[PDB]
Amino acid sequence: GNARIGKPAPDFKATAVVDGAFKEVKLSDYKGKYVVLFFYPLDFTFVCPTEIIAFSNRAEDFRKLGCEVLGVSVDSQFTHLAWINTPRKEGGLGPLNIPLLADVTRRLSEDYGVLKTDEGIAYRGLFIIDGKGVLRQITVNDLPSVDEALRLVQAFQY
Amino acid sequence: GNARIGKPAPDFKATAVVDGAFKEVKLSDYKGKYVVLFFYPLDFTFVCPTEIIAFSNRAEDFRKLGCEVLGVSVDSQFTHLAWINTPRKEGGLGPLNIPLLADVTRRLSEDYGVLKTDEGIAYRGLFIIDGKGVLRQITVNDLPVGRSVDEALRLVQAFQYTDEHGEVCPAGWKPG
Amino acid sequence: GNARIGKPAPDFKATAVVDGAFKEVKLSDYKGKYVVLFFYPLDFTFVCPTEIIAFSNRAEDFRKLGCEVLGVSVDSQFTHLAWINTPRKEGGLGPLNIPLLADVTRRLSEDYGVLKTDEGIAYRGLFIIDGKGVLRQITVNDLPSVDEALRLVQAFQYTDEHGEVCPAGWKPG
Amino acid sequence: GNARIGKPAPDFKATAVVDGAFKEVKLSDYKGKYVVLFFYPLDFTFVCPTEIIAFSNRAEDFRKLGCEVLGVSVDSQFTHLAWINTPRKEGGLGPLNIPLLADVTRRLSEDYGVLKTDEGIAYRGLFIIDGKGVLRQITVNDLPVGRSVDEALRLVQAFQYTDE
Amino acid sequence: GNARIGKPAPDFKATAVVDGAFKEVKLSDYKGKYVVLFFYPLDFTFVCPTEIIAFSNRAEDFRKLGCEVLGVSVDSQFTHLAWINTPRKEGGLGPLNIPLLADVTRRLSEDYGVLKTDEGIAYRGLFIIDGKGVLRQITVNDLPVSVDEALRLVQAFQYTDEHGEVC
Amino acid sequence: SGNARIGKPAPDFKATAVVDGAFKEVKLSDYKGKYVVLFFYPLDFTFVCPTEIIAFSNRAEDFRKLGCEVLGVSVDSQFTHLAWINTPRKEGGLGPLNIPLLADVTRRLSEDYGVLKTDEGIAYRGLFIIDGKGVLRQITVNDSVDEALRLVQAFQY
Amino acid sequence: GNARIGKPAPDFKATAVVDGAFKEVKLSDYKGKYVVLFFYPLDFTFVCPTEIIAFSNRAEDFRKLGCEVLGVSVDSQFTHLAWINTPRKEGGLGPLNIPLLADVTRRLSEDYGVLKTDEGIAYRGLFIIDGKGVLRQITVNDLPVGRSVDEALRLVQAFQYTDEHGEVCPAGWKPGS
Amino acid sequence: GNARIGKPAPDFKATAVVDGAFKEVKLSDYKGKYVVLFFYPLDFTFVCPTEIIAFSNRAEDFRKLGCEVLGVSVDSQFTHLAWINTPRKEGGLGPLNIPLLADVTRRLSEDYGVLKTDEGIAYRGLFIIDGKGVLRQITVNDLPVGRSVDEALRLVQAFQYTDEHGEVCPAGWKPGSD
Amino acid sequence: GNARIGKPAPDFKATAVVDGAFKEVKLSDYKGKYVVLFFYPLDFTFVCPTEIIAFSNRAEDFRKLGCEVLGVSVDSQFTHLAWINTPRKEGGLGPLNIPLLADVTRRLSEDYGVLKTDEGIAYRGLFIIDGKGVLRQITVNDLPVGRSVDEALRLVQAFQYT
Amino acid sequence: GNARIGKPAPDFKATAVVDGAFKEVKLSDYKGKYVVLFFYPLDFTFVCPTEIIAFSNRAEDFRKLGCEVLGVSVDSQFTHLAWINTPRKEGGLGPLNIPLLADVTRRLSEDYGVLKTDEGIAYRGLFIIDGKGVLRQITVNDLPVGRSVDEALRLVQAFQYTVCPAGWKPG
Ligand SMILES: [Zn+2]
Ligand SMILES: [Zn+2]
Ligand SMILES: [Zn+2]
Ligand SMILES: [Zn+2]
């Protein structure tokens, strides 16, 4: 894809579930703040969404560092909302303190280089963008990390 | 895309939810049977899923005609299953007696010509495939209506009746 | 071609046979009314014209719903007129209560995505357009359903006075 | 298009009405014979007289010159047959001694340079092909009425005199 | 070449012999008149120029119709003039009432698609252009020969000009 | 941006390295059946503690425990690497190490891995994990050895 | 074109007017003799045809040297013959002692490199070709030059003398070999 | 190249050997005189340089018509000087009564259309240029032709007659015009 | 590469070790002075750095003639200062009186056509530029050791003599 | 041009004056030998031909080291011979024991990168090629007189057989 350390981070625009409702979210809304953008594969799987819950737990920890967190999968906003409104006993996520972006066109995952072209889903990926829109960190792998994410958003301010 | 009237239907294979379990589905599995293949854009929306409820309820009526009914969206099999397991009053589908196929790669939708490349979801499209794998009818709709299930069943009958007992024609018309 | 479901139907203008005379019909003539636009391959074949007879028989039924039925092949208006003026005994249509549009340039069939380019004739397509000129249904068919398109023109109108049927106990989230 | 004086005439293959029956016709069928190939815009036009009748009536005279006459329009063979079998009272042609070729794909008209592209129908065109497949005459115009069978007979003569 | 029925006719500009003097003629000069443009192979031939003299003889008939008749070959205007000066007795054309245009670059013949590439001379071709500069007739063959047919055609086109597609 | 792709064969590399005092050639095929941490850094003899490199050498055997050979990389020559190793630590230095330092003098390794900062000719701080079958599993680029250990353990269930 | 000094002259085949008749001529018809081949733009013009008349008048002096003279324009053989049959008072040439070759295809002018491509006519070119078919001299003039006939003749003689006697050579010069 | 008959000859600028010394010369120096500009392939060859010696020997007849003769090769002016000073008996020219211009860049040859492309030397082109600087004749010879010097002299007279008076015309010939 | 005798020298800009610290050195700086720009392959080699040492020693004899010398390798300015500040008993340079330019992007070596391409280091090469910016001399070979110092000295005088 | 250190030298084929006669010479005749190929601007100049003369004087010295010395300028072989045949007192070279190669097409000078494009003559350039045909040395300047022969000698020996400051040690 188009993600390059030290260059303006690839721009993005998506419908998110932000507190039970739908909002267009775009990178330019976060001018002057850090952004952790993380990608994950699929809503509603049988794997513990440790990752998503951890981030949502620590989200105010990130907000005190001047940093919003954004989750992304290829699922629609209608599926994110449903997944949030399902409780963790029937499988779901419960309420959530971070947007979940819908990447139904798959252009965000493509722009960021994390699209598993064979399967149409995102790798687990994490990107840190600074208050000026500059991509400062790239991380990509496979099976299921929030602590290092916080290390890093401090580090770039230390 | 690749869907051509009167030609072999574009091939497909997909993971589906079937009586609450994950199963792989491919067109060749249906050789010898008629197939109604219909697409819809998204699970879990606020549009009422009358089309899907109707086919599910009528599915034994299709099967009596040796026809299998398959539904498709770009959502994953995990999402389909979550939708099926969600109550109708919470916006869900409830139990269902037809496969729902996951087309997460968007290839089924591209092959059949119904992908809105903007947005990345299918148009509401419906395809009738006979027992030889030949594509015999294409329909696209703007929104659902449910006694369009009734139209699918009539066509399946019509196609099978034409395949044998000739083809209808008003009285008092002759050729040359 | 250019036909997009839920979008302004492609514009058309053609010469049609109407009441046994020629008339220039165009899309804009029909704003505020429903159009069932259907394509077929050729006039004067040995294939019984089932759908066209039926459409003309049910023509008033359609107009009693604010719907205009228009037929289309790549044959000229002269061949269409000749075809209507041929009695069904002898392979013709007899008199006819729907326009037949001439698509000699093949631009209508191209525009509506139903030109079978190898042969220069149209597939058997049916399009349903509404009073705003938005295309609301596309159907393409191997072989020759007139009652069906009639049923559909209503259920697109009770989807505007009433608002989509929906089973009992289905509510959104 | 591809038609050029003194060169091979562009090849052609089409479905024709030949004595009320459909039949494939191709240029190769006529090697060793002259061909008059005429194009006309539209079946069932009655605003003006048709040349098809005169060519049919004179077919034998062309045949005495070793020459086959072929008509072409973009109408289908079904339309060609309906026009033949239409009563003369209502403009029918009646039976014909020459083939009428269907150019529904418009490839014949395109290849011969006579497609009126804004309308999808052929201009009125007349081509004369010698027995070796070589194009010897081009005439094209946009008139609403044939022009002449007689001058096509003359030309066929003149070319065969110049051959010897 | 460029000649297409129903499209503007290929423009042309040439030096012509017009009543024993040289003149530039251009297609644009003729807007509002019909033009018959005929091409022939060679001046001073041993084949009787039956076509050119006839056009000259019938020149008034064409002018009754508002039609101009222009003959063209690849010969120069100096050859055209000498051919017109030479007596019909000793092989010439004698005086002439139609222009003869010199196509020495062979561009008129190319543009009208009548150049026999092998020989570098024109086929016998006949073109009719209406008063709006639109081409209405193309006739080309490789025979060696026509004036009454040209006269018929101009009248037929003028009729459809006035009456329309009717007849 | 280079050729490193998750789930594909990692980009091939060969370089001249410093291995416990001496120059040796390291190819990628050398580590079959073995996991590699390929880690890039910008420059030798710089003015800030080589914490990362030092950390990685100390825990070298921790990675050797896991079946994982670590491999550092900069655009500096193997002469400059050996010099750096044999400098003291005072005003600058490095000390010995139990990890190869590769010399990416051609810049082809940095380029192939997408980490070359072109306008300055040096590597970004990048780290890559490759498994015993050659397949790139992890990509990290910054501009922290504990996290690297965790990651290596995970890829083996 | 394909005219290269010191090399075989490009062959040609053309229809020519030789003493009031049409004849096919070929460069090859002239092996063993010198050829003076000259080009001019157009028959029947108002330029006095001084060089063509001079060539015609001196044609026998040329044949004494065993040299044949050929005139070329892109005019047809029918125009050439007419021009010859036209008296010089009417502006023609009168009867004529040199062939006039027709280059209606323009290939001969093109091959000899003297085709004024934007006008379709030949420059005034003059080519001297020896008895082995070798191109010995290329000349191009702007206007017709009657004195070029006298010089062509003097040059044919010089080439023939050198052919036989070798290098003319100033007194006392020797190569530095 | 750029040499067009009946158009202004291409401009040129070059160093020449004039009466034993070097002197730049350019086309505009010669406005108002005739100019025979001739090219040859190479100094110092074993080809007897008959035309250069004939032009030298007859340079005063040219000058009597106000015509300046100019020889050109791709050799340097140093080579031209040495060639002039080499005894004729060792392949030299001996003292010389016309300029030899040096064309070491190959631009005069290329502009005049006589560069033999694969060898980098000139063909023997000869160019007659009138007092108005107009290119009046192009000649190309294969070898040196002593008599091509007489020819050039007679042609220069001829052209000058034409300018004076006009082109005379045979007896009996009148155009067919009005 | 882009080096042409009698044409303006290829511009350069690089960070250098001057004395014992950093400084951007640009060609334009030297307008009006001769420049001797030499390239060598690698810092910290095991082979005696005879040519750099020699250039440093004769630095002021070069300066007498209005000419500044500059060394170049692809090594970073950090590696340069480490070499300079390493002592000669341990393979190092000791102090220098000539700037050492860092060509980490390899743009200098490419522009001067000296980049031994398949290795990424410069051949030994010497270039000489006059006060008006013109390239007057190009010398390159693949030899290990160079005695181009005396030769460079003779060449500078020569170019001024004209 | 095409001359690259460590690559095969650009091929060349030229007519040369060897011992007062013309001879074709090409790079390939020198296989197994070293070649010093030097370029100079112009024959017959007013600048004393020190380098050409010195290379001729030392030619045998080079041959004893298995090295052939070839001179090149854009002048023709006829001009070379005339220059050799002109006495040194009248500006000539006198007899010469190195080939002089004619580069009249200027392809040699272009291939080696020394053609001074505006004037069409070569820079003073000097190239050493080893017996493998590999280019080992490139030198070019615009000096009015090139002093070269001694440096060429030492270089040739240096390539054929591959000081050090104070207490400098490696590690
Ligand atoms: Zn009228
Ligand atoms: Zn004798
Ligand atoms: Zn004898
Ligand atoms: Zn002497």
Curated annotation (Swiss-Prot), chain C:
Pfam family, one: AhpC-TSA
Record has Ubl conjugation as a keyword: no
Listed GO MF terms: antioxidant activity; thioredoxin peroxidase activity
Catalytic activity: a hydroperoxide + [thioredoxin]-dithiol = an alcohol + [thioredoxin]-disulfide + H2O
Post-translational modification: The enzyme can be inactivated by further oxidation of the cysteine sulfenic acid (C(P)-SOH) to sulphinic acid (C(P)-SO2H) instead of its condensation to a disulfide bond. It can be reactivated by forming a transient disulfide bond with sulfiredoxin SRXN1, which reduces the cysteine sulfinic acid in an ATP- and Mg-dependent manner.
Principal location class: cytoplasm
UniProt keywords, alphabetically: Acetylation, Antioxidant, Cytoplasm, Disulfide bond, Oxidoreductase, Peroxidase, Phosphoprotein, Redox-active center
Annotated catalytic residues: 48
EC number: 1.11.1.24
Residues where Phosphoserine is found: 109
Enzyme class: oxidoreductase
Domain Thioredoxin: 3-158
InterPro entries assigned: AhpC/TSA, Peroxiredoxin, Peroxiredoxin_AhpC-typ, Peroxiredoxin_C, Thioredoxin-like_sf, Thioredoxin_domain
A GO-annotated cellular component: cytoplasm
Biological process (GO), any one: response to oxidative stress
Subcellular location(s) of the protein: Cytoplasm
Other facts: The active site is a conserved redox-active cysteine residue, the peroxidatic cysteine (C(P)), which makes the nucleophilic attack on the peroxide substrate. The peroxide oxidizes the C(P)-SH to cysteine sulfenic acid (C(P)-SOH), which then reacts with another cysteine residue, the resolving cysteine (C(R)), to form a disulfide bridge. The disulfide is subsequently reduced by an appropriate electron donor to complete the catalytic cycle. In this typical 2-Cys peroxiredoxin, C(R) is provided by the other dimeric subunit to form an intersubunit disulfide.
Free-text function comment from the UniProt entry: Thiol-specific peroxidase that catalyzes the reduction of hydrogen peroxide and organic hydroperoxides to water and alcohols, respectively. Plays a role in cell protection against oxidative stress by detoxifying peroxides and as sensor of hydrogen peroxide-mediated signaling events. Might participate in the signaling cascades of growth factors and tumor necrosis factor-alpha by regulating the intracellular concentrations of H(2)O(2).
Protein family per UniProt: Belongs to the peroxiredoxin family. AhpC/Prx1 subfamily.
Subunit structure and binding partners: Homodimer; disulfide-linked, upon oxidation. 5 homodimers assemble to form a ring-like decamer. Interacts with TIPIN.
Protein name in UniProt: Peroxiredoxin-2
Organism from which the protein derives: Homo sapiens
Gene that produces this protein: PRDX2
